């Protein structure tokens, strides 16, 4: 069981007849997935994992960059010294699950410890040929459409003492988020909004605040909106149906957790938290430094009904502790699903 790097390959259940661009890309870039993949539990062996130094993440990153290069073609791409022009037709866009697979001579160890924080020893290890299916959802602040924690909320970080290390909050219950650009009674084709059930979110940060306090005891735990910067990271940004949404989260990350109780202080209405969103055409790229420019949005109603399954938090540096939404490095998005896996060489 000697840890090792090697070129993984992706597998998917992509469908030959599907025009959706994830299917199209996986059709030529991945192999079909197995209906019954074998898994061999080993209750005896204990191996150490490290989700923050896992070469599987970097290989996934390169594939997703590569998928976006073939799929979401911008009208023009501006990178410092250059400007590339292409046809930018509108496209059908809906992420599908990708599995990562070890070539022969290597195996994938899977941690079965349902509260494993991503670092150190895992006592219950399995062997699989491929990971489970991971939807490559590119987003900031909120992790969408992932998998849930099995027991309690899990706090992951490379080092909770180092405030510059991103914190990944793995929820154990999804929180529904519905964003829509609706179909003069209309006035702007670039305005959208998201709805989140207030009590569901009140209960979430209550239990997230409980887990955070375990790590930062005797402190008031505050949630505050993003620090300033690029719009991609100061808002909850994500792609919906090919359109780039930027959703303001100031009413979302806005509460205090004192004396074991969470007190939401963001704005709310019919028991619902609303985020105002813009659809933007000029976006700052996450694949590399520069800008990409897209056509105006499609007609009709644009809706993404998603499941928040995790959060990206950052703690302010210095008698209190303040947490803001983070993200930006999509490697953390892949880490949040690949944490339990580790590629190993069967010498």
């Amino acid at each position: 069981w000697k840890e090792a790097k090697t070129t993984l390959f992706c597998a998917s259940d992509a469908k030959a007849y599907e025009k959706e661009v994830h299917n199209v890309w996986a059709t030529h870039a991945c192999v079909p997935t197995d209906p019954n993949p074998q898994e061999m539990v080993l209750a005896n062996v204990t191996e150490n994992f490290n989700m923050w130094k896992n070469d599987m993440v970097e290989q996934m990153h390169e594939d997703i960059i590569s998928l976006w290069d073939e799929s979401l073609k911008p009208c023009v791409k501006l990178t410092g010294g250059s400007a590339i022009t292409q046809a930018c037709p509108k496209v059908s866009f809906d992420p599908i699950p990708l599995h990562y697979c070890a070539p022969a001579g290597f195996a994938i160890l899977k941690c079965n410890n349902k509260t494993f924080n991503g670092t150190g020893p895992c006592r219950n290890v399995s062997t699989v040929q491929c990971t489970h299916g991971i939807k490559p959802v590119v987003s900031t602040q909120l992790l969408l459409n992932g998998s849930l924690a099995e027991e309690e909320i899990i706090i992951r970080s490379e080092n909770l003492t180092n405030n510059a290390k991103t914190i990944i909050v793995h929820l154990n219950e999804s929180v529904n988020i519905v964003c829509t650009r609706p179909n003069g009674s209309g006035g702007n084709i670039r305005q959208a909004h998201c709805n989140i059930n207030e009590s569901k979110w009140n209960n979430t940060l209550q239990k997230v605040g409980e887990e955070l306090a375990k790590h930062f005891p005797s402190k008031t735990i505050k949630f505050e909106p993003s620090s300033g910067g690029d719009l991609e990271i100061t808002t909850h940004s994500f792609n919906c149906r090919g359109e780039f949404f930027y959703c303001n989260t100031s009413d979302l990350f806005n509460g205090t957790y004192r004396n074991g109780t969470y007190n939401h202080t963001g704005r709310s209405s019919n028991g619902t938290i609303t985020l105002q969103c813009k659809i933007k055409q000029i976006i700052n790229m996450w694949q590399e430094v520069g800008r990409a420019i897209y056509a105006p949005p499609i007609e009709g109603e644009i809706t993404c009904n998603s499941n928040i399954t995790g959060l990206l938090l950052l703690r302010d540096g210095g008698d209190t502790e303040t947490f803001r939404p983070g993200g930006g490095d999509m490697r953390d998005n892949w880490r949040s699903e690949l944490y339990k896996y580790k590629v190993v060489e069967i010498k």
Partner: nanobody, 121 residues
């Protein structure tokens, strides 16, 4: 292994011009945004100027500073004009964790050693 080579700075007369530069080594430049923070004595490190896809400036800048990127030289530059005693501080180069700029110092995992800028009247 990542290192930031800082250049420029030191003593300026009030109203003068100064240039700061910072070469990123052991990392792919066009993968990371770069920024300058400053720390005056007794104060919190504060964001001055940063650039990934687009430049950002701290509120106290007021169009006096220009930040730019040189991909060929893996270097980012800060041109500071109309400097004032208020601008005296240790200036730190920083490499972002990503392609994006945050104003909060915790969006950065690599820091230069810091160079003193002193504006003398």
């Amino acid at each position: 292994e990542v290192q930031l080579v800082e250049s420029g700075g030191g003593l300026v007369q009030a109203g003068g011009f100064l240039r700061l530069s910072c070469e990123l080594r052991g990392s792919i430049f066009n993968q990371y945004a770069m920024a300058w923070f400053r720390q005056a004595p007794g104060k919190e490190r504060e964001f001055v100027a940063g650039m990934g896809a687009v430049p950002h400036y701290g509120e106290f800048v007021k169009g006096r500073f220009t930040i730019s990127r040189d991909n060929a030289k893996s270097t980012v530059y800060l041109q500071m004009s109309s400097l004032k005693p208020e601008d005296t501080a240790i200036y730190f180069c920083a490499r972002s964790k990503s392609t994006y700029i945050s104003y909060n110092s915790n969006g950065y995992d690599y820091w230069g050693r810091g160079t003193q800028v002193t504006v003398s009247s």
